[PDB]
Every structure is written in structure tokens, then in C-alpha cells.
Amino acid sequence: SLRRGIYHIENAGVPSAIDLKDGSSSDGTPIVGWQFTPDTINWHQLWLAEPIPNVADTFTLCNLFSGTYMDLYNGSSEAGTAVNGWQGTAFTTNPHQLWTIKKSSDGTSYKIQNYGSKTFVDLVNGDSSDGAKIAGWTGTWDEGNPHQKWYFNRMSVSSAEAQAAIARNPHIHGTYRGYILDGEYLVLPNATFTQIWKDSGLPGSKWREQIYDCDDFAIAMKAAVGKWGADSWKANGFAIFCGVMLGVNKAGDAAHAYNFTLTKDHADIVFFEPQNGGYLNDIGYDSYMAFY
Amino acid sequence: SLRRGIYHIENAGVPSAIDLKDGSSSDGTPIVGWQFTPDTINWHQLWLAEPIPNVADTFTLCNLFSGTYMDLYNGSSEAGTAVNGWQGTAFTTNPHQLWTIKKSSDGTSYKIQNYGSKTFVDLVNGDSSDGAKIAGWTGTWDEGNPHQKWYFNRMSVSSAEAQAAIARNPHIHGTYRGYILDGEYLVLPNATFTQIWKDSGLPGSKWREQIYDCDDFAIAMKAAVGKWGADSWKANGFAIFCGVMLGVNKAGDAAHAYNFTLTKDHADIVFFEPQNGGYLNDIGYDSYMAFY
Numbered sequence: 001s002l003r004r005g006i007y008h009i010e011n012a013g014v015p016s017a018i019d020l021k022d023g024s025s026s027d028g029t030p031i032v033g034w035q036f037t038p039d040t041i042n043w044h045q046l047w048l049a050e051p052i053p054n055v056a057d058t059f060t061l062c063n064l065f066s067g068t069y070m071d072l073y074n075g076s077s078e079a080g081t082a083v084n085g086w087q088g089t090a091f092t093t094n095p096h097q098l099w100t101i102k103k104s105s106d107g108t109s110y111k112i113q114n115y116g117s118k119t120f121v122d123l124v125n126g127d128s129s130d131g132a133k134i135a136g137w138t139g140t141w142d143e144g145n146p147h148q149k150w151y152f153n154r155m156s157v158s159s160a161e162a163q164a165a166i167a168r169n170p171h172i173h174g175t176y177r178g179y180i181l182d183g184e185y186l187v188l189p190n191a192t193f194t195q196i197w198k199d200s201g202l203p204g205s206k207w208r209e210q211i212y213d214c215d216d217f218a219i220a221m222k223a224a225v226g227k228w229g230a231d232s233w234k235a236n237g238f239a240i241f242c243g244v245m246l247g248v249n250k251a252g253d254a255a256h257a258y259n260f261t262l263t264k265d266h267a268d269i270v271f272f273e274p275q276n277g278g279y280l281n282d283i284g285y286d287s288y289m290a291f292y
Numbered sequence: 293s294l295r296r297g298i299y300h301i302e303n304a305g306v307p308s309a310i311d312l313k314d315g316s317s318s319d320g321t322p323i324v325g326w327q328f329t330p331d332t333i334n335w336h337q338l339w340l341a342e343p344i345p346n347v348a349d350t351f352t353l354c355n356l357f358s359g360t361y362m363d364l365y366n367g368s369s370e371a372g373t374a375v376n377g378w379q380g381t382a383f384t385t386n387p388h389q390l391w392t393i394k395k396s397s398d399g400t401s402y403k404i405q406n407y408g409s410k411t412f413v414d415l416v417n418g419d420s421s422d423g424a425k426i427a428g429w430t431g432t433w434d435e436g437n438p439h440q441k442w443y444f445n446r447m448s449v450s451s452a453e454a455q456a457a458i459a460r461n462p463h464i465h466g467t468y469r470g471y472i473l474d475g476e477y478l479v480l481p482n483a484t485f486t487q488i489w490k491d492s493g494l495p496g497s498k499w500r501e502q503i504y505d506c507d508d509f510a511i512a513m514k515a516a517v518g519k520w521g522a523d524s525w526k527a528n529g530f531a532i533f534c535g536v537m538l539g540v541n542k543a544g545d546a547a548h549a550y551n552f553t554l555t556k557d558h559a560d561i562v563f564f565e566p567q568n569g570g571y572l573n574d575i576g577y578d579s580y581m582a583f584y
């Protein structure tokens with residue numbers, strides 16, 4: 001089953017992602033194929049999949065940027081029916097905005113079926129053009145047709161997945177305790193994480209004993225990523241991944257506060273030094289506390 | 293012995309505090325008697341007392357606002373010698389800026405003796421006027437003279453004192469763990485704590501599931517008090533008190549993130565709700581984690 005989380009949905013045939021055109025919140029904004037840049041935030045191309053509790057393999061798909069929902073226009077079963085962004089809610093009963101999402105016959109890509117119409121999300125003609133129509137279209141669960149096959153590239157971790165990445169790490173103190181604040185986290189590329197750090201003003205901050213020392217830098221960086229999340233996205237029901245860690249050196253006679261983020265493969269953490277914007281696989285401290 | 297910490301130094305005879313005139317960082321800025329408002333930040337009237345490791349009962353006195361040091365002009369023993377703010381360091385050997393501070397004959401107020409001159413800090417003529425001269429003056433450790441007696445009104449807590457206030461509280465969970473980030477904290481009046489909250493922009497922030505929920509409010513409020521500390525004071529070697537707490541309700545089926553501060557008497561904590569600016573003696577959660 002598709003997990004709850006944020007996905008970049010990429011056609012199996014051509015390198016086009018499902019895109020809410022101009023990220024517009026207007027009802028009836030076309031959802032189109034568009035090219036994408038890996039290891040960036042693709043601002044109009046991120047979809048929060050919310051499982052519908054009492055319907056198997058069925059979701060709403062909320063555009064992270066617009067906060068509007070993937071909607072089959074008037075729920076029509078006609079091939080070529082418009083797929084648009086439309087106002088809704090995460091657990092709607094509106095079958096226009098309900099999508100059964102299951103593995104295709106290649107066992108890696110998915111097909112996306114409208115719960116009402118039983119027609120599939122289709123990149124019309126496999127057109128690779130920026131702004132290519134996406135429509136509801138007749139099809140089957142089993143056929144190879146790449147127009148209707150979609151890789152769900154997972155952009156978020158659960159709290160359980162973040163916990164696992166930390167526990168993997170070789171720099172966790174025996175006394176470590178972790179404090180989980182949210183359920184589902186957007187993982188930033190370092191390029192974006194760095195940009196939030198720059199736009200925070202922290203690069204200009206001076207170290208001062210107690211009054212602006214490591215703990216103030218680390219907490220200011222987490223607050224800045226929290227502020228960026230709320231200000232950047234209109235969807236709800238997720239957080240941005242940015243950890244704070246307290247650590248102690250091997251000698252046990254010096255402590256440090258710093259940040260951490262997750263690798264591209266979501267499997268491991270990477271330490272971030274908010275006093276200089278460095279990423280490190282070893283920051284010279286073993287974490288005894290984290291909150292994220 | 294006088295503890296390390298921040299003091300509002302108030303004459304024993306008249307309601308004048310030791311004041312660095314206009315908070316100026318200029319060398320030779322007069323230190324004067326000035327009236328004060330209790331339960332405010334008295335911006336020009338706060339002094340960080342740093343104990344000199346290998347000299348008994350002897351300190352530097354750094355003006356929290358200016359970052360400059362109480363200085364007996366050319367270390368003269370002449371009665372009426374100017375006491376000014378002057379550039380220095382927390383552990384200087386300059387005897388102009390070293391002060392032996394011990395209980396007076398009334399056992400509650402102190403006298404302040406220059407280590408070099410062995411003359412005392414004196415509110416000349418006990419003048420209660422705003423801008424009254426303070427000078428180094430002949431005297432003795434034992435005499436009653438109120439011109440040379442000073443209440444050291446303690447405005448800061450150690451980490452150990454903050455730990456004690458939390459442990460006192462009746463809303464601490466069995467599983468509580470506390471994470472101490474600094475050593476010495478300025479305690480804010482609620483009036484100031486509230487102002488930092490207002491000036492943060494948090495009063496305008498909307499609750500949003502995960503993306504700006506209780507943990508984001510609580511951490512944004514701690515970051516705002518950290519930013520206010522650095523931006524407001526030029527002295528180093530202290531922090532501003534603002535805690536973050538995670539808590540769980542009696543039923544054990546709901547958790548909440550919030551802030552806390554300390555009472556005027558420094559003995560107890562008070563909970564702060566950053567989603568509405570309320571102070572509560574009971575926020576309906578028992579803390580299982582704090583960092584401050």
C-alpha cells in the first residue's frame with residue numbers, strides 16, 4: 001500500500017511530473033505534465049497523499065503549495081475529462097477528489113484511479129511538453145500503457161523513519177533520548193536547507209558566551225525552518241525536517257548544540273553546524289538529546 | 293559571599309539605583325544615582341558580577357546594556373573620585389575595575405570597595421536626585437553610613453536555581469527529563485516576556501496541523517527571547533530565561549508543547565501559552581521534557 005506522505009509523481013514513460021499549473025489555488029486550475037529538477041523543491045509538483053480510513057488503497061492528493069486537491073471534473077468517466085486543482089478537505093467523501101492508488105503491472109510505478117469514475121490519471125499521448133494535458137482516461141489495472149503509470153517518488157519521512165535514521169548513526173551517546181514533535185516530515189535537499197539558513201540571518205550572527213552560543217544558533221535554525229514551512233506551503237498535516245541535537249565529545253568534558261537533516265535516500269542523518277553552514281558526517285560530538 | 297549573577301543595585305538610604313548614565317558605552321560615562329520602576333527591565337541599571345577566581349569576595353561589575361565596567365577613575369583613593377563606565381574584561385587585573393563586595397553591618401545590604409584604592413562606592417550626600425554623583429569615598433566596613441550601603445537585588449538565576457524551581461512544581465511527569473543549555477539566566481517580568489511575544493509576531497500566527505502547531509509556537513517563542521537577548525544587551529556570560537516544555541494530560545492520551553518562565557521570587561515556574569499569551573499555574577499537562 002502507498003504510505004501517507006508527500007510525493008513527487010513522475011510519469012513512467014517521459015520525465016514529466018504531475019504539476020498544478022502556476023501553483024494556482026483557483027478552482028479548475030489545470031494539472032499538467034511538466035519537467036522537473038532532481039534534488040530541488042519542485043514547488044508546484046508536491047502532493048500530500050492522505051489515506052481514507054474505511055476505503056482500501058484510496059487517498060486524497062493535496063498540492064503542498066496550493067492546498068487544493070486533485071479533482072476529476074464533475075467526476076465524468078469520459079476519456080479526456082479534465083484533472084484540475086479544486087478546493088476540498090483531506091477526508092472528503094467527494095468521489096471527484098478520491099483516488100485509488102496501487103502498483104501497476106511493472107510492480108514499481110502506480111496507477112491512479114478515480115474512486116467515482118474508475119478512470120485513470122493519463123498523461124495524454126505521453127506528451128513530454130511543459131503544460132501537457134493530464135486527463136481521466138479509460139484503462140485497466142494490469143496494462144503496460146506508460147501514459148497511465150506514475151512513480152511516487154517519496155519526499156517525506158514518518159517520525160518512525162526519522163527515528164530509524166538517527167538510531168543507524170554511529171555518533172549517538174549511550175544516554176541519548178529523542179523527542180518527536182510531529183508525524184510526517186518533508187526532507188529538504190541540502191541546497192534548500194542552506195537557503196533557509198542564509199535567509200534566517202544566522203550566517204551574520206556572532207558567537208557570544210551564553211547570550212548567543214551554540215544552543216541559540218541551533219534553536220534559531222529550527223525556528224527558521226518552522227517559519228519557512230508555514231510561510232511556504234498552504235497544505236496542512238506535515239512538518240519540515242530539521243532536528244536539534246545536544247552532544248558531548250569523546251573525553252566527556254565538552255558539549256555542543258547543532259542541527260541535523262536526512263540524506264537523499266532518507267536512510268541516515270547528516271549534522272549541520274548553524275555557526276558556519278557546514279554539513280558533517282562527524283561533528284566531533286555524540287548526541288545525548290534530539291528534538292525534531 | 294555574593295553569587296555570580298545580574299543585580300539591580302539599590303541604595304539603602306534612598307530609592308536610587310546605580311545607573312550608567314544614558315547606558316552610554318563611552319569611556320568615562322558617569323555612573324549616577326537614578327530612580328527605578330520595580331518589575332520592569334531597568335535598562336541602564338543592571339550589573340553582571342563576575343567573581344575573580346583567586347581573590348576573595350572580589351568582582352568585576354559589567355553594565356548589562358553597555359558591556360562596559362564600573363571603573364574608579366585612575367584608581368585614586370581621594371574622596372569624591374569619579375566612578376564611570378570604562379572598557380575592560382570580565383577577569384581583568386586592572387584594580388580600577390575590581391570591587392570587593394561584602395555584607396555591611398546591617399547584614400542585608402553590601403558595601404562595594406575598590407580593590408586598589410580601598411575606598412567605597414558612595415552616593416554623595418545621599419542625594420536622591422536623578423543623576424546624583426556616585427564616587428569613591430573614604431569609609432569602613434562596619435559603619436552604618438547609608439551613602440555607602442547597597443542592596444544587591446538579584447535579577448538572575450543559576451541553572452541549579454531554575455532546576456529547583458521546576459522540581460518544586462506540582463505538574464512534572466514521572467518520566468520528566470530536563471536539558472540545561474546555559475549557566476546564568478536573566479529572569480524577565482511577565483510584562484517584558486509578553487512584549488517579546490508580541491514583537492515576535494506569534495500573536496498573529498494560526499494553529500495548523502503539524503506545519504505550525506504547538507511545538508512550532510513554543511520553539512518560535514524561545515528563539516524570539518534568544519534573539520531579543522543578543523540584540524538588547526552588549527554584555528556576555530548570561531542568557532535570558534525562557535523554557536520549552538512538552539507535557540501530557542492526566543488521561544495520558546494528549547500531549548502539548550508550551551513555554552515557562554519564573555515567578556518574581558525566583559522560587560517557582562509559571563507556564564506560558566504562546567498560542568494566546570496566557571500565563572497559567574496549571575496548563576492541564578504534566579511536563580515530561582524541558583529545555584532552557
Ligand SMILES: C[C@@H]1O[C@@H](O[C@@H]2[C@@H](O[C@H]3O[C@H](CO)[C@H](O)[C@H](O)[C@H]3O)[C@@H](O)[C@@H](CO)O[C@@H]2O)[C@@H](O)[C@H](O)[C@@H]1O
Binds near residue numbers: 027071089092094096
Ligand atoms: C455533486 C456535487 O459535489 C460537489 O460539488 C463538486 C465540487 O466539489 C468541491 O468543490 C465545491 C465548490 O465548487 C465544494 O467546495 C465541495 O465541498 C468540494 O468537494 C467539485 O468536485 C466539482 C469539480 O469536479 O464538481 C462538483 O461541482 C458539491 O459541492 C455539490 O453540491 C454537489 O453535491
Ligand SMILES: C[C@@H]1O[C@@H](O[C@@H]2[C@@H](O[C@H]3O[C@H](CO)[C@H](O)[C@H](O)[C@H]3O)[C@@H](O)[C@@H](CO)O[C@@H]2O)[C@@H](O)[C@H](O)[C@@H]1O
Binds near residue numbers: 079139143
Ligand atoms: C500508443 C497507444 O497506447 C495505447 O493507447 C493510449 C490510450 O490508452 C488508454 O485508452 C485506450 C482507449 O483510448 C484504451 O482504453 C487503453 O486500454 C487505455 O490504456 C490513452 O493512454 C491515450 C491518451 O494518452 O493514448 C493512447 O491512445 C494503446 O491502447 C494503443 O493501441 C496504442 O498502442
Ligand SMILES: C[C@@H]1O[C@@H](O[C@@H]2[C@@H](O[C@H]3O[C@H](CO)[C@H](O)[C@H](O)[C@H]3O)[C@@H](O)[C@@H](CO)O[C@@H]2O)[C@@H](O)[C@H](O)[C@@H]1O
Binds near residue numbers: 363365366379388
Ligand atoms: C595603570 C594603567 O592601567 C590601564 O589604564 C587604565 C584604564 O584601563 C582600562 O581602559 C584602558 C583604555 O583607556 C584599557 O582598555 C585597559 O585595558 C582597561 O583596563 C582605565 O581604568 C582608566 C580609568 O580609570 O585608568 C587607566 O588609564 C592601562 O591601559 C594603562 O596602560 C596603565 O597601565
Ligand SMILES: C[C@@H]1O[C@@H](O[C@@H]2[C@@H](O[C@H]3O[C@H](CO)[C@H](O)[C@H](O)[C@H]3O)[C@@H](O)[C@@H](CO)O[C@@H]2O)[C@@H](O)[C@H](O)[C@@H]1O
Binds near residue numbers: 415429435437
Ligand atoms: C551625614 C554624615 O554622614 C557621614 O558622613 C558622610 C561621609 O562619610 C564617609 O566619609 C567621611 C569623610 O568625609 C568618613 O570617612 C566616614 O567614615 C565615611 O563613611 C560621606 O558618605 C559623604 C559623601 O556622601 O557624606 C557624608 O559627609 C558621617 O561621617 C558624618 O558625621 C555625618 O553624619
Ligand SMILES: C[C@@H]1O[C@@H](O[C@@H]2[C@@H](O[C@H]3O[C@H](CO)[C@H](O)[C@H](O)[C@H]3O)[C@@H](O)[C@@H](CO)O[C@H]2O)[C@@H](O)[C@H](O)[C@@H]1O
Binds near residue numbers: 019020022035042045
Ligand atoms: C516557483 C517557480 O518554480 C519554477 O517554475 C515553475 C515550474 O517549475 C518546474 O519547471 C521548471 C522549468 O519551467 C523546472 O524544471 C523546475 O525544476 C520545476 O519545478 C513549473 O511548476 C511551472 C508550471 O506550474 O510553474 C513555474 O512557476 C522556477 O522556474 C521559477 O523560477 C520559480 O522558482
Ligand SMILES: C[C@@H]1O[C@@H](O[C@@H]2[C@@H](O[C@H]3O[C@H](CO)[C@H](O)[C@H](O)[C@H]3O)[C@@H](O)[C@@H](CO)O[C@H]2O)[C@@H](O)[C@H](O)[C@@H]1O
Binds near residue numbers: 312314333
Ligand atoms: C531605555 C529608556 O529607559 C528609561 O529611561 C532611562 C532612565 O530609566 C530609569 O529612570 C526612569 C525615569 O527617568 C524610570 O524610573 C525607569 O524605570 C528607570 O529604569 C535612566 O536610566 C536614564 C539615565 O541613564 O536614562 C534613561 O534613558 C525610559 O524612561 C525611556 O523611555 C527608555 O525606555
Ligand SMILES: [Ca+2]
Binds near residue numbers: 210215216
Ligand atoms: Ca543560550
Ligand SMILES: [Ca+2]
Binds near residue numbers: 504507508
Ligand atoms: Ca511542527
Ligand SMILES: [Mn+2]
Binds near residue numbers: 172
Ligand atoms: Mn562519535
Ligand SMILES: [Mn+2]
Binds near residue numbers: 181182183502505507
Ligand atoms: Mn507537533
Ligand SMILES: [Mn+2]
Binds near residue numbers: 462463464576578
Ligand atoms: Mn498536573
Ligand SMILES: [Mn+2]
Binds near residue numbers: 210213215473
Ligand atoms: Mn549554552
Ligand code: NA
Binds near residue numbers: 027028030
Ligand atoms: Na479549468
Ligand code: NA
Binds near residue numbers: 051052055056057058
Ligand atoms: Na484507506
Ligand code: NA
Binds near residue numbers: 319320321322376
Ligand atoms: Na567623565
Ligand code: NA
Binds near residue numbers: 348349
Ligand atoms: Na574570588
